[PDB]
Amino acid sequence: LEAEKVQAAHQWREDFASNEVVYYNAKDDEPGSQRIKPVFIEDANFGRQISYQHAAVHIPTDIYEGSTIVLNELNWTSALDEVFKKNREEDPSLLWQVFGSATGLARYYPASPWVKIDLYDVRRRPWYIQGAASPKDMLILVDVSGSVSGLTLKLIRTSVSEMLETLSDDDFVNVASFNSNAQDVSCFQHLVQANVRNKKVLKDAVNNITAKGITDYKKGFSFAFEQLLNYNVSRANCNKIIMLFTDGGEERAQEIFNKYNKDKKVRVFTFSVGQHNYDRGPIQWMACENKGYYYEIPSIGAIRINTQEYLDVLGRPMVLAGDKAKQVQWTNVYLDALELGLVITGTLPVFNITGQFENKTNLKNQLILGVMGVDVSLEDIKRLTP
Amino acid sequence: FINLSFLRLFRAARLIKLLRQGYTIRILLWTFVQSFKALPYVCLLIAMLFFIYAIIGMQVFGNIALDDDTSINRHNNFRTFLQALMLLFRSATGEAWHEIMLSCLSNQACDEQANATECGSDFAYFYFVSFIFLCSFLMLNLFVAV
Amino acid sequence: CKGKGAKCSRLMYDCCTGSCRSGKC
Amino acid sequence: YMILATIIANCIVLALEQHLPDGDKTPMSERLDDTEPYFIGIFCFEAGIKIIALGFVSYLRNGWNVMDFVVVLTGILATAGTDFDLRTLRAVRVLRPLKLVSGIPSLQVVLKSIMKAMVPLLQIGLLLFFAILMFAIIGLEFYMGKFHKACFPNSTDAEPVGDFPCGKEAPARLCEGDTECREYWPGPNFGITNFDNILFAILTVFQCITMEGWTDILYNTNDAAGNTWNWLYFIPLIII
Amino acid sequence: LCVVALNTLCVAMVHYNQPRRLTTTLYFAEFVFLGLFLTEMSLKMYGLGPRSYFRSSFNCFDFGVIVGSVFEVVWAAIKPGSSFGISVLRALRLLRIFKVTKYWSSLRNLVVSLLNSMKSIISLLFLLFLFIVVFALLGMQLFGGQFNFQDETPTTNFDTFPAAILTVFQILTGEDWNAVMYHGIESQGGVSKGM
Amino acid sequence: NILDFIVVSGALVAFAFSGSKGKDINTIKSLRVLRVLRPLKTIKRLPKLKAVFDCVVNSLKNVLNILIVYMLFMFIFAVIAVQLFKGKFFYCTDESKELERDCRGQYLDYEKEEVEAQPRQWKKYDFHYDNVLWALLTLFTVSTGEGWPMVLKHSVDATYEEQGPSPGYRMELSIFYVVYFVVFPFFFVNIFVAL
Amino acid sequence: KGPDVCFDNNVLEDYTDCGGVSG
Ligand SMILES: *[C@@H]1O[C@H](CO)[C@@H](O[C@@H]2O[C@H](CO)[C@@H](O[C@@H]3O[C@H](CO)[C@@H](O[C@@H]4O[C@H](CO)[C@@H](O)[C@H](O)[C@H]4NC(C)=O)[C@H](O)[C@H]3NC(C)=O)[C@H](O)[C@H]2NC(C)=O)[C@H](O)[C@H]1NC(C)=O
Ligand SMILES: CCCCCCCCCCCCCCCCCC(=O)OC[C@H](COP(=O)(O)OCCN)OC(=O)CCCCCCCCCCCCCCCCC
Ligand SMILES: *[C@@H]1O[C@H](CO)[C@@H](O[C@@H]2O[C@H](CO)[C@@H](O[C@@H]3O[C@H](CO)[C@@H](O)[C@H](O)[C@H]3NC(C)=O)[C@H](O)[C@H]2NC(C)=O)[C@H](O)[C@H]1NC(C)=O
Ligand SMILES: CC(C)CCC[C@@H](C)[C@H]1CC[C@H]2[C@@H]3CC=C4C[C@@H](OC(=O)CCC(=O)O)CC[C@]4(C)[C@H]3CC[C@]12C
Ligand SMILES: CC(C)CCC[C@@H](C)[C@H]1CC[C@H]2[C@@H]3CC=C4C[C@@H](OC(=O)CCC(=O)O)CC[C@]4(C)[C@H]3CC[C@]12C
Ligand SMILES: *[C@@H]1O[C@H](CO)[C@@H](O[C@@H]2O[C@H](CO)[C@@H](O)[C@H](O)[C@H]2NC(C)=O)[C@H](O)[C@H]1NC(C)=O
Numbered sequence A: 001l002e003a004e005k006v007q008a009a010h011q012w013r014e015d016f017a018s019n020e021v022v023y024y025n026a027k028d029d030e031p032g033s034q035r036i037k038p039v040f041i042e043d044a045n046f047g048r049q050i051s052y053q054h055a056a057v058h059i060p061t062d063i064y065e066g067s068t069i070v071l072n073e074l075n076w077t078s079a080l081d082e083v084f085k086k087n088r089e090e091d092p093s094l095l096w097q098v099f100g101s102a103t104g105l106a107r108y109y110p111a112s113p114w115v116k117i118d119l120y121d122v123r124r125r126p127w128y129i130q131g132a133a134s135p136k137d138m139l140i141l142v143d144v145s146g147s148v149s150g151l152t153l154k155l156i157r158t159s160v161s162e163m164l165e166t167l168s169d170d171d172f173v174n175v176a177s178f179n180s181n182a183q184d185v186s187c188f189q190h191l192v193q194a195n196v197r198n199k200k201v202l203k204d205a206v207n208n209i210t211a212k213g214i215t216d217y218k219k220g221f222s223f224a225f226e227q228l229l230n231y232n233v234s235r236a237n238c239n240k241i242i243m244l245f246t247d248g249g250e251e252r253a254q255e256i257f258n259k260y261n262k263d264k265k266v267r268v269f270t271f272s273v274g275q276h277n278y279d280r281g282p283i284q285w286m287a288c289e290n291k292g293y294y295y296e297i298p299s300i301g302a303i304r305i306n307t308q309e310y311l312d313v314l315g316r317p318m319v320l321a322g323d324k325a326k327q328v329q330w331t332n333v334y335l336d337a338l339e340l341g342l343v344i345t346g347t348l349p350v351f352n353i354t355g356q357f358e359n360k361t362n363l364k365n366q367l368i369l370g371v372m373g374v375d376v377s378l379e380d381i382k383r384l385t386p
Numbered sequence B: 001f002i003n004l005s006f007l008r009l010f011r012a013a014r015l016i017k018l019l020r021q022g023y024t025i026r027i028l029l030w031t032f033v034q035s036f037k038a039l040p041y042v043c044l045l046i047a048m049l050f051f052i053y054a055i056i057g058m059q060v061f062g063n064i065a066l067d068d069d070t071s072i073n074r075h076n077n078f079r080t081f082l083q084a085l086m087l088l089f090r091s092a093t094g095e096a097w098h099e100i101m102l103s104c105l106s107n108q109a110c111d112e113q114a115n116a117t118e119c120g121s122d123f124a125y126f127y128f129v130s131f132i133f134l135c136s137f138l139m140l141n142l143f144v145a146v
Numbered sequence C: 001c002k003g004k005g006a007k008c009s010r011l012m013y014d015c016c017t018g019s020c021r022s023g024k025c
Numbered sequence D: 001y002m003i004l005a006t007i008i009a010n011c012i013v014l015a016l017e018q019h020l021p022d023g024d025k026t027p028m029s030e031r032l033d034d035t036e037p038y039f040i041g042i043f044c045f046e047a048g049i050k051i052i053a054l055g056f057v058s059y060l061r062n063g064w065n066v067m068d069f070v071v072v073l074t075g076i077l078a079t080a081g082t083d084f085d086l087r088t089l090r091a092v093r094v095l096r097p098l099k100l101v102s103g104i105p106s107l108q109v110v111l112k113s114i115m116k117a118m119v120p121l122l123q124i125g126l127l128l129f130f131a132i133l134m135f136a137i138i139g140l141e142f143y144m145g146k147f148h149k150a151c152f153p154n155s156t157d158a159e160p161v162g163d164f165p166c167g168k169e170a171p172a173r174l175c176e177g178d179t180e181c182r183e184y185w186p187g188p189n190f191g192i193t194n195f196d197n198i199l200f201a202i203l204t205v206f207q208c209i210t211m212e213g214w215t216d217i218l219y220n221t222n223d224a225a226g227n228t229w230n231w232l233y234f235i236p237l238i239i240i
Numbered sequence E: 001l002c003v004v005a006l007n008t009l010c011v012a013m014v015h016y017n018q019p020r021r022l023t024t025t026l027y028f029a030e031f032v033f034l035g036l037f038l039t040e041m042s043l044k045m046y047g048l049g050p051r052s053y054f055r056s057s058f059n060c061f062d063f064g065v066i067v068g069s070v071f072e073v074v075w076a077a078i079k080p081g082s083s084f085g086i087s088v089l090r091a092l093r094l095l096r097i098f099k100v101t102k103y104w105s106s107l108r109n110l111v112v113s114l115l116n117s118m119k120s121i122i123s124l125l126f127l128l129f130l131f132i133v134v135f136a137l138l139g140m141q142l143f144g145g146q147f148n149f150q151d152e153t154p155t156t157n158f159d160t161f162p163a164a165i166l167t168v169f170q171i172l173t174g175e176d177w178n179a180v181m182y183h184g185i186e187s188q189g190g191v192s193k194g195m
Numbered sequence F: 001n002i003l004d005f006i007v008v009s010g011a012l013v014a015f016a017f018s019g020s021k022g023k024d025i026n027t028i029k030s031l032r033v034l035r036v037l038r039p040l041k042t043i044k045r046l047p048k049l050k051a052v053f054d055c056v057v058n059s060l061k062n063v064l065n066i067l068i069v070y071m072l073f074m075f076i077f078a079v080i081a082v083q084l085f086k087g088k089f090f091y092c093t094d095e096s097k098e099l100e101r102d103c104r105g106q107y108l109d110y111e112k113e114e115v116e117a118q119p120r121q122w123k124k125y126d127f128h129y130d131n132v133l134w135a136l137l138t139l140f141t142v143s144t145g146e147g148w149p150m151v152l153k154h155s156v157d158a159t160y161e162e163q164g165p166s167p168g169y170r171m172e173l174s175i176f177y178v179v180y181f182v183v184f185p186f187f188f189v190n191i192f193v194a195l
Numbered sequence G: 001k002g003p004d005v006c007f008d009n010n011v012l013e014d015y016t017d018c019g020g021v022s023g
């Protein structure tokens, strides 16, 4: 509630020369912001040194601090420290409280130094992913024709693995490959629970694909649409998406889309992978005509960002639902990133409601600002069962 | 002891023994070689151009660091007179002369044993551009002169 | 483009500075 | 003029082709493949009318007519050849543009004029060959099997740390670190530029007399056997 | 001649990150010089007469440059952006400085000789293109679509016709032809069966 | 005699500044480099060497006019290339960023199978066409044929005045280079040789 | 047992922007 209210009253200033931003950047030993030096007293209930005076901020390595977006985000999130302190005072036995931004940064309390190179990204975390959208029925079409041989095949494999890394036990996934003939890349033949074992099997299967043949989009899309109408097996009965991985084609396949999803009940996200000179027009048309989105992955450095942005599109019906789409969910048991043991995380999404007082913007207010998170250690639960 | 492997060249010298049968080839080769031996002073001028440019390059770019992955390295440098001459011949034929030009311009990490801290100048812009003009021209003057 | 010391192919011409000699920019 | 237009259209079609790896094909290539019978039929008709107007072994007296006849014959064989051996038969189509040289006599005159100057040069070429062989043999006696040693870490999976030849405790390039000058490594340029036999030596000497990458071979020989005497082989080869 | 020299000097000061004042000054000077040259051309054509004006081979070049400059001006006005680069060709008129010298006859007879052989040079230049197109097609048949045996396909490939003809041109210039030879040999397969 | 005076006096000054501390090391280096004029004294000492030098000078004087024409044409091409390519030879150390304001901070570099953090810095290519002198230098290097495919790639990938490269954005611009190769290294060099 | 809360195919969804129109 406080995050929504504070962000609603924001100005989006374009310069930060004299209006410095004061915050404690984690993992430290630029013009536009100031830095905080904390005291870092040793405290129990944490295995590290913490400071209750303010909140720490983590910004991923490949995201530049001091840009306009990150500086505006820091300025409007500087008002969360008061509620962090109030929550800590109302219940001393409280662990990490975190705001994960769609910008990329995470502001967490109490302030602690961050834990080689750091590859942590807030938007890839299980709690952020479960709070950013609803369960899904992902189906991945991989183009394995002759034209994808080379580096645009290893990029496709890496991208498919990274996108499988974004699924959980509530999501159901399958992978199919087509070259003038569509077939499953593994032994599954239908959507599976997408747990650790099934994801490992799918990753091993997709690492073994070789490229040869001629692309036929109609057959692959017919296979994909038929795989989503099984209903003989356990599914999620929620978001149904087809995630196509190609380089570039010439066929739009209007007949398949018209026949199967006539009412556009299934989204189609499309990815153009590699450095090539094929036509991207049909790919973007297929993305636009089926509530989907078009992405470009030309290198390894673009794989991580582009394989997680599809959760922005899936979050539109959740923000449009209103306050009914605000339910505290709890993750599976996982090891805390800041070395705290086994924890579960409570999750609540945060909506952008600037201009919703008069209800006039409705343009970028259909995306989430970020995710609330609070950690509960399994020792806390064990203390309640003598 | 001292190597004695050059004698194997001797049995390879018998090919010239079959060069007699090229009545048209032999006379052409002899005529051009004899013309070459009639113009030694133009060759001396070319050698003097090489000598002057090698000395200038030795003085100006001699103490560039021999760091590899650049065009001045353990194979192509200005460290010695013979190395400078080899660099000049490589540029005269033309292999990466623009790369060698870029490898010594006013901001090169300088040699450890060198007494200076900033070695390498922007004279290379002239140094390499004039040479490619001069050498070639002299060569073109030599060829016609034959 | 590829940085100094990175592995390259001569026929790609994708070194930021210098040439691709002996397989390294 | 209609035949020249057909030849120009065929050249445009041959320019419109696209090639993809691992057996992939664009739909436009499939569309363009259908136009081959029309061109073959028109060429056969144009070459059929000349046979009943000049005879044979006089229609076939002209060399350009012979080239036209072989082009159309290979086209006909390719159309009727369903067998797997057509790669060397489909390559004849690249001579189809040359047909428009036979259709414009001015181009034939210009070609005769330009080739009139290449007859005295042939002897020069012979001399050039005599040079290359004469150096290749020398390169066969000094640099044969010298680029196969390389710095390998400690015999784990045969990954050379560097792409340069090394020498075993000699005035050559000693291995740096804890690597060793082990036996067998393909070579510098995928193992193509070497002096293993007379054919490789001939190829590398020819590649060295065009002043293209000869310094790389010089440096390889320098770091494989010492830089004391290598120049004496390469400076004359460039000079002569 | 002084007007042409001033135009050359002003068009030659164009550099990256120049002051805006210089950009506007050159923008207006372009119109001023184009108008001056247009008036000079019209005055000369009215004086000498159309046929007499086009009699000289040098005035035809000036007329072509003037019409190309007008086309470039209108093109850039209706679509601000790239520049064809035709108003610089007026600097060729500066060659008329050779008239007052004693080397006009030699310089002018070479162009008279050149222009007398437009047919032969065109035929020779089109015959060189004809053989560059035959070799590009042969390379397309040989190594067409077979250069993906490594990380990425090189810029020097034989997949399309523009790429193949540009590769053949680069080989003809002699630069890095041995690298393309190595890459094609590896494409045909190894040093054993691909030589 | 002037030559001899400068080579004698030049060393004199160096000796005068040598008997003290390191005064004006730049002038010390300049006067030491000036010592290379020692062999040139032989030009007039040997009559045959003077004769061959005079022959070289006469050969240069016989072609100075075509040299001037060649320089004018190359200046025109340099101005055209400056108009075409100025400002478009900038790049970011990671290819994902196409603007200077985005080329700031750290980025993940995937080399030697170990991701590492590298600074994100906005740089410029070695050979560009920012002004007419840089264009002349680049075109001279192209005319020699050394590394001209690299500048061709940089010119094709050029997008706009302050943007990073985009692969194969303008292939048609290669026409420029092809035309250049048909003029200076093919035609002008051959007329130099023939003259 | 899966979650009983599903949010999809909302009528008021914009969906007028893809990744190709902007780029
Ligand atoms: C929650 O939603 C609200 C609106 O629903 C959103 O507020 C909007 O923020 C954007 C900033 O992204 C403002 O945009 C103004 O107008 C343009 C558009 O970006 C900017 O000008 C340049 O635009 C280019 C893009 O083409 C950009 O690259 C560049 O950096 C911009 N600046 C330059 C060139 O200096 C303006 O700068 C920008 N700001 C102004 C004019 O102050 C919208 O005006 C905002 N809308 C409203 C109603 O306030 C808000 O950001 C969302 N919340 C979060 C956390 O993102
Ligand atoms: C068209 C006409 C063509 C013919 C005319 C032009 C030919 C000129 C080139 C001739 C060859 C010159 C030498 C080339 C090889 C250079 C030597 C080399 O690379 O190897 C070094 C060699 C031994 O090396 P390595 O194997 O390391 O030693 C044992 C290791 N413990 O170390 C040695 O001991 C090698 C000694 C090399 C020769 C010494 C000097 C010879 C002088 C030659 C004068 C001109 C040649 C006249 C004959 C021409 C050919 C018949
Ligand atoms: C985003 O950044 C802004 C600038 O860094 C912050 O805005 C500043 O907040 C200050 C206190 O919160 C203001 O100081 C006083 O503000 C009151 C409000 O009406 C007024 O009395 C005066 O403006 C001022 N009093 C003084 C100076 O004695 C700043 O005026 C105000 N603006 C600036 C500095 O330009 C925002 O608070 C910040 N947003 C969040 C959420 O923290
Ligand atoms: C055709 C005849 C008249 C030749 C005349 C020479 C000028 C056209 C040339 C030579 C000097 C060149 C100038 C000398 C050097 C430079 C580089 C540059 O100067 C700068 O200091 C800005 C560069 C920066 O700060 O980034 C701007 C172009 C300028 C002055 C050049 C523009 C083109 C100039 C004016
Ligand atoms: C001796 C002379 C007469 C022969 C010179 C050969 C030229 C006619 C060839 C070689 C280079 C070819 C150029 C090489 C590459 C290109 C780009 C290409 O344009 C495209 O259509 C590419 C666009 C795309 O597919 O993305 C064709 C024109 C051009 C410059 C070609 C036109 C024909 C050129 C100029
Ligand atoms: C299970 O899925 C199949 C197809 O994936 C559905 O289709 C029937 O499959 C069974 C299998 O023998 C047969 O009845 C017919 O071949 C199919 N058609 C019909 C009309 O039955 C099937 O309905 C699904 N459900 C079940 C319980 O099998």
Ligand SMILES: CC(C)CCC[C@@H](C)[C@H]1CC[C@H]2[C@@H]3CC=C4C[C@@H](O)CC[C@]4(C)[C@H]3CC[C@]12C
Pocket (backbone or CB within 6 Å): B106, B120, B121, B122, B123, B126
């Ligand atoms: C005969 C004439 C044309 C010789 C060429 C003279 C010009 C181009 C040369 C002569 C000496 C050169 C200078 C020598 C040393 C340095 C120091 C270096 O840190 C920056 C470049 C700078 C300042 C050079 C710039 C270019 C320079 C001035």
Ligand SMILES: CC(C)CCC[C@@H](C)[C@H]1CC[C@H]2[C@@H]3CC=C4C[C@@H](O)CC[C@]4(C)[C@H]3CC[C@]12C
Pocket (backbone or CB within 6 Å): E083, E084, E085, E086, E089, F073, F080, F172, F173, F175, F176, F179, F183
């Ligand atoms: C013959 C010489 C001396 C004068 C004519 C040469 C100049 C003016 C001509 C020759 C070929 C021309 C190029 C041909 C094609 C293109 C592609 C276009 O999209 C941009 C301009 C550009 C790059 C032209 C620029 C002007 C150009 C370089």
Ligand SMILES: *[C@@H]1O[C@H](CO)[C@@H](O)[C@H](O)[C@H]1NC(C)=O
Pocket (backbone or CB within 6 Å): D154, D178, D180
């Ligand atoms: C590692 O290298 C050393 C010397 O280079 C050698 O003695 C040793 O046997 C090597 N290791 C193995 C496992 O062979």
Ligand SMILES: [Ca+2]
Pocket (backbone or CB within 6 Å): A145, A146, A147, A148, A214, A215, D024
């Ligand atoms: Ca395909």
Ligand SMILES: [Ca+2]
Pocket (backbone or CB within 6 Å): B094, B095, D211, D212, D213, E174, E175, E176, F145, F146, F147
């Ligand atoms: Ca070269």
